[model samples]
Target chain A: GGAVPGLRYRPAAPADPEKVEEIDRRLETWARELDLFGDFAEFQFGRAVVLQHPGAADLERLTAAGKLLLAENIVDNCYCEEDEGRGGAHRGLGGRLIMAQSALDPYHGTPEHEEEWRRGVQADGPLRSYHVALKDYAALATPSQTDRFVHDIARLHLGYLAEAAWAETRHAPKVWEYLVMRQFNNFRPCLSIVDAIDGYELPEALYARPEIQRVTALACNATTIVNDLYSFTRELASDPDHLNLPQVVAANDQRGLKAAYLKSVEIHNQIMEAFETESALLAATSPLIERYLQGLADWVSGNHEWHATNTDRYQLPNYW
Target chain B: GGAVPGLRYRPAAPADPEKVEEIDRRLETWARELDLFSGDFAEFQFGRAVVLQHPGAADLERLTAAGKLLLAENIVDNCYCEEDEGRGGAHRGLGGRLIMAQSALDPYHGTPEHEEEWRRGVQADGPLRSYHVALKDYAALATPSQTDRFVHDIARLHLGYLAEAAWAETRHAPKVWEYLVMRQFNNFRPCLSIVDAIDGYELPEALYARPEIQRVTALACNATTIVNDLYSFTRELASDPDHLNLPQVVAANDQRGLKAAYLKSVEIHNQIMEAFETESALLAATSPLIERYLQGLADWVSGNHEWHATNTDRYQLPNYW
Candidate 1:
């Protein structure tokens, strides 16, 4: 409810009512197909992409972006994270994610082996959702773009493994180390495809620059910290040992949970500042890059808005 | 042969023996596929030319990627729309074939049945196979945008091929301006498209797509292709075939004769080379990547011309020059 130091924490861009309705309907169908909607319908993923990316012209592209986020959400919760509240206790989740990563970036093998591998992946709903979402996105992309998305998806899977591995051994990561996991194993897979959704491309050359990478990581890190901050109370209620940015900060630094949440906000604001500072350099080149960065900023802010507004899924403590 | 007024002839770059041989081996397999370069393969040392063009290429992978791409481009040039190859005479309906091959660059998303058809047309390639394999290698090393940009450039190169095919079928003697139009599309822009990918640097598409940038790119292509025409005109004249280079185009409509046309064509090349330098210098003032990209273009034009001059297999002078 309260503003952080730098970011005012307002939902800047609102979704089109029609887009929300259409995207929501698709999400309903998507959730039904996965049969994971028993807990997901309340979270309402449909409006987020509509609010964040108004540039997508067709429902197909819009739904594709939305489905990607939804797929990631379901897989992360069902496989890796503590979603026991949703009637699940995931065991050997890392193994599942590794298998799913293979599906996203399939092997170049004999047709006999390849067909069996696909059948194995498609047999499961959450992983199958991820596999389908990836193909739908890749079907829209050129060859290299498909590979790039696969690369990022693999990174996200690795991120999921790191968190799950930590839980298996009760290994609490220090604040800095936890941030590393959050930074790369991030919403990058979502934001990186923004151009494809918008029907234009930001050149690989421009996107791969060190400065651009830094800016993108900052946006993702800040938004991820928002997830840790806003979803704090809900996770605490579900599982007290749930490891997020705030929890890691508190455990590592030996601070109270409330203070750790404040520290997390400070860290997020620092990233926000760094993101803005480096983005000034984004103007060094293309209008497409400029638009792309602007989209990231908007999406970052819009994510905060969604978490803050979606009280059914996320809750905040009075002091925190 | 005479040097152009603006571009004083000099060859500063040379290829490494080891890398050249390794790349040459790849060219052997690549040509053996189509059975196109049985005798000419030994004579063609294009790996040397690729290395010469990318003097500052960072690693062996980058250099090899450039070599593969250049070889594929040469194969297409020779097989599809060039001076009748050493027996790989361009088949009729080359325009239609090029359109099918171009699908590798400009991909089409169709329903299941049509999509398989599109893929089948491209994968069963002659030179297009080389193009696809070269691109797959390039794709691994490049960003999505880098790979796609190369595809688009190849698409433009195909358009130029189409234009050339139209004239070849009818024996249309085009004016210098009409020839330039075809030349612009078919020139080294596609080769230049990989400069960023090869060098591990990226210029934003906006800056790369800017008017000044395109102007600089156009000038570089004009000079590079003209260098080829200037050197190979003699060999082509010896064949005395359906088509010719810039100098021959000039000679046909000239007030004077062969030497005059040669001199004017050299002047034309010199003008384009000078224009490229001017635009490059101006754009280089804007940003660091622009400076880097322009430098590559500068190196490429000089090295490309140098390779033509050095490749005794490809070039022999006329008595007039």
Candidate 2:
């Protein structure tokens, strides 16, 4: 019941707890570096700063602009669900840190509460602060052959906005449209930041290839499906109004929930298989691309392992 | 041997030839408006830039008709090659204009035939190169984002036409579903709708993304395709006896006679037309822009019908009793 029969779920060796802490520290340090004007502490949510500046006071340590980009991602995740008055960020059992953004459900809160929340962090809020970092990073980075990185970021934000809009409404988009939506929402930007997190710099020439972009997209989507499967029960309990692939498949195909769930699993497996095949083909072209593929594979495998082991975040349901 | 029995052959109200000529004159006038650097002859000749400067209504009407003209003339030259070719190049009149119109819309990309012409440095390459250079002019006149969208829609037109051209040369006979997809690709939807982008109004991406809009467009494409199939049947029979069309496919697959298959074709076309009209009414209420767009589509359907009914080169045979 825990594992879908044919879905690819390879678990990588776990990162040490101490190594995880160090990574977290580095993220915090990077955020603090952006606190040049001392404006960050004013907008702190617990130990996390929501409105940190993205100034380059400490640029000597960074390899590429993507390092700060990854740091900014950590800041976003922290503010999205910051742990108040905790000693530090909460690490689930088995040393797994589930830094995923929670589904924003507009239904639970009152209008006043939503209004107050919006006033503090709406258009000019923490999300805007997060966007400022990306904007600055784009300005600072070397211009590639194309503006794909910026376009991908733009797409990612658009997906988030669309998801937020759809959550508030009853209208279900068509499956084709939904899939295109997911390509943006499925933590593609976050997964893409993994290369930066690992200090891998892709040459502008190699990055421009459509094939490279396709492989990256496939990997992100496939792994995101894995995240969806693991987070489903918790998400169903917390945010019932949110759209997931199983619900979409059920609504569109007129299938029962369990049948749709099984179908989603099969679809996820097929996509995972495609990612593996495509990444392998791409690996033949360049060692740097091969390294990037390996990073992606490891991330997918590591993500699955984290979900499987972290019982605190992903409590197994009796139905499963 | 004239009209295929049972095919939907409703001849709508006719367009005046004088009015059409006036429309064509305006399209050329708009093209002249874009030849700011005085390279019009070389541009149109070498397929450099297609000057499609649609500043107003007259231009839109002409462009829409020009797109349809391409469809009609290309269908004749490509689908009914032998009989038309032997008639001392009379049927080849629209090919050059079609090439020019196509060049204006999609400048960089070319069909396999166009590519061959380019490689051989043929004189016909001028019309092929015309649109590419002209697109840059339009892009300068419009916003980058809007220009991107315009280019995409125009590319859709080329893709559809080129795909059909490739399919036509093949011995493969696609199933109904496959043919339907192909027809949508080759359909005049893109080229015709580009008029809205040029002069009237570009439909918002959100509105266009809706399933209702997609259904309306699909129905329009199918309805227009069926009309084309019915009108071009005689020419197809004379030139391409092996060519696969909706009626012929229906006859072969359903084990029906020619008359029955032709009736099925009519039924299919009428059903699509009904669906299109119904969906369009629902869509028209959304906005004034949408209503105008729908009105343009309605005009296109009737204009297409009228053009087929009146054009002798298109409707060579009368009625099949």
Candidate 3:
């Protein structure tokens, strides 16, 4: 394998260190609520990575809304990832409480547990609350804004079900399917709303524009690639079932370990370049878009910075 | 594996053999018109298969109309599979056809040939006409929902053809997981849904969309697709080896030889058949309409199996024959 140049994070906009600390505190509160981050003794979902979601908003109400939404997300993740597995019972479920709250007593290989999980998953489940929250959010926005918001969230949910379905097959998804799965599972819909959360109220008209959509997609893909670059090793070492871009590209393109790593970096750079180019074009259109685009750029840069510095969540290789 | 008894055809209702031949002749005529089954050159595109319609009332009229609709299906199949590739120039195409016919005289590399074909397909003018004709046939006998369903099935067929066209890109041919996606695309759902076109009535709208209906569909599609696997192997082997089929996928994944893979495929198909039978029986209490629909499905599965086993040209045992 050839020596591949490491793709270092280049800041598109500087992150405010103070704001980073504030956001981290908010995320910590969410983790406590979802019982996600805890000591090994307290952690119940077997041996798993200490995955975290780092985000915040400037407005008090938006920050409040963000916490509620983020908590719901963690609950669903636990349901799909942890509960939908062969495991033992642990009552006083903190992370497990989310399960108990839904009346889905821990999976004990019983008919009652199976039916309970079905109810939790089927209509009137806690999962439905996630969609209901988005629908309520849309009530405050314009019709066009509501439609796009609904679509983005719906696409995310579809991706969630697809991942569960694919897990049952025990076969590697095609590279194309893997690409689609990433787009849905990338959490872009949740991240895209951060601009509004941070007080940059992008007008519905501007945000709904085709050009704006193109730019948003580019930003999402670029940020997702950065996340993949950071988490590739952690996922490969710890989560065998999970599919990442490097592994997909390696399998499909028949590249070696180092070659595939470099290829993934190359792919990431290409998208980042596109993001920069398109955001520039959009920013040139008007002061409003420029402001909105600036917010997105900050999010991207902040996200990259967070990943680079937050070694606790993402265990980076010592050699790197 | 154990000696799996070959899944045999059991008639749900006694087949009128004479009517089958009559319907087959009509399909053959359509195949000839579309350049599908000519001597020494059975391209097998353009001409569609006559899916037996089982409406209880006004039988002859329904069968006659079905023949025309299926023929049109065959034409669109060819357009997507054979005509779209290496054709003349056109662009601006996505979903379905508005750009029906063109005499593009170019297949130059990089010359938007793919786009042109896409445009022709998305517009689907000819197939649209065929569907229009079929809709008119349904208008007199079926309900608004039934007509809508028939049209939906036709669209599925068109989409399946387009998907098959995409699979023509050898590199993009799928593995087993992706192969299931193709199975949905190439489903007999549309063709079989119109089983009411002959004798049974359409299920109530609520029942039509139930999970039971979906499960029954998935099982039937799995079984029918396996049947296609056995029959089309000879044709595909001679023509397009790149197309992924069950035996190919099984051989590659399990390191099973062709015969073993074929047998394994049979085993899987039998399980699916068993599942379909049990599920169909469970729907017995639902309604006469639902029961009739299940019966139609059973007929389709058994009929397809019988066709594959007996169709002489398709089922060649070489000198042993």
Candidate 4:
């Protein structure tokens, strides 16, 4: 994408290092206890919560509307970027973050190569679940097609995290690894979200076009791989510590280190969403991209097992 | 008083029956593992909780108000049975189930006598913490004293399930016991209904009346005796299962018998609620009694750590449906 800056970062220094160190230690201990981190990658996850004592005011009244915000974010992101798969020939629904040819080297090679690799090397059925989803979305300008792309990649990336020891020191449980691998299999079921689309309609002839079909497959395939690889690499590289070697290997980040590759893929997926929203001619035909992303983000958070006494107490960023 | 037979039961089996069983097995195993439950009465001292999860629209919403019903029952019970030390007159509150006579050779002897004997022997510095609360209305007749008396006694009888067990089981951690006991303590704290009657002014004279002063002292003493007895009895009972010869002294018929006693107490408590609600004054005072009983029940349930979820899921009862 044009002028997409790299992930923002600041260096750690000594003057305020002690407080940082305490937070680091506590985070490390918590992560280790929960097996979320390893000796190599010490980390922690927490957020603020509201509470009241026995004699305090009626606590049952407080209502937190976290999920609503999450849903909004998804819709916003999807509509902002849509024409990503068209090689810059097509316009986006919102201002799409178009990919520069330069941003193609890092993210493209592994997933494309892995999708090709799983055709023979991997025996576990989930390895091919994403491929099936991609094949289904092969040529339609539809949100179901877009979700299949995102869901497939998310699953594949999670599988990689499972195989690798996120908690290198503690090591992930064997069952945990199996479950993560299976999560992708679950995502395959949602690829048909297009079937849920009723208010919108797209051109019937678009499915018959070979160019559109190939574009659809590549766009989803690329989106899935880039989003996952970026998430894996960013989480692994940026944690206060860098113990997540297994995740790094799973993303095959070592090979995807070249700039431009992952960014291009993400920009394209964003454009696909943007295109679906802005082109009224396109909109009548496809599911709203922003809504799909927002819905997807929310589904993940709910399964995370967070609870709230009422809508007032539910927190989004914390649980999500 | 009106009689409308009603009962409250868990909607379906508890969501975590296996979890409950495991916790039970663990407690027993934990006791054995720690060398705590070594002898004869060890098994009897500890019992597993079969969670009675709620099932109904508004059950969760309305649960807190249920404590008010319990408080009313305790009020009704204390008015009739108790007789204060001052004279031949009956105590201000009902008192059918006072530690009664902790003397030997009573009509209903042995299990009860042993319990009474233990209570009588508890010293001032004993390990137990005992205290009693007067059913608010028992001290005033502005509200129908007789109906209030019935509700108070019945709730007290229901509460005796924990109290009776509290008197004997040593493994009953203070943290856990407080769940049931402390709530009961607070349940009797609010005197808003009584204070509001005389326009929030207790007329300085009536506030210091001999009967009021006697009522306070009796409550203090009764509570002291009850808590102390609770501590001593539970500890001995809890430890006896692991000790030598204690099992031989007791009978097999008592195994898991405390649960049955608790059930009977629940039945009696429910009965009093049915009776009190029929009376005009009590139906109006329904809010307080409901609050007391529900609060106590919540305390009892939350005390069992397994039932508690400290994460985001805390207090969100498992919905099996």
Top TM-score: which candidate number? 1
- Tens-digit per-residue lDDT, B158-197, candidate 1: 5455556545544567656546655766668788888777
Please identify which of the two predictions, 1 or 4, would achieve the higher DockQ against the true structure.
1
Which has the better TM-score: candidate 3, or candidate 4?
A: 3
DockQ of candidate 3 against the true complex: 0.03
Tens digits of per-residue lDDT for model 2, A1-320: 24545568665654444434443455445555544114332222211111011121232222223333453454445432343235642322100111111011010122332344344333332333344344454444333311334334434433443453354334465443355456665555545544443444565346534467567767777777777777777877997666777767778788777777777787777777777888888898888888778767776766566566556566543345
* DockQ comparisons of all candidates to the true complex: 0.02, 0.02, 0.03, 0.00
The 10-residue segment with the lowest total lDDT in model 3 chain A: A44-53
Per residue, candidate 3 scores C-alpha lDDT tens digits across B1-321 of 111247544643434656656566655654455444324222231111333234242465566556655555555555544554333533212121311211111000111332344344323455544444444555566654455455444433433444444345323434444344445545666666666655536564446545467567657766776677766766776777776777677666677677777676666667667777777898866677788778777776665555455455545421111
Write one digit per residue (lDDT tens) for candidate 4, span A50-70.
111011111111111111122
Q: Which scores higher on lDDT, 2 or 4?
A: 2
Better of 1 and 4 by lDDT: 1
Candidate 3: residue A180 lDDT (0-100): 47
Q: Is candidate 1 or candidate 4 better by TM-score?
A: 1
CAPRI grade of model 1: incorrect
TM-scores of all predicted structures: 0.50, 0.41, 0.45, 0.19
**Chain B TM-score of all predictions, in order?**
0.88, 0.65, 0.74, 0.22
Best by lDDT: 1
User: Once model 2 is optimally superposed onto the true structure by TM-score, how far is the C-alpha of residue A312 displaced, in angstroms?
Assistant: 37
In every candidate, how many clashes are there?
0, 14, 19, 90
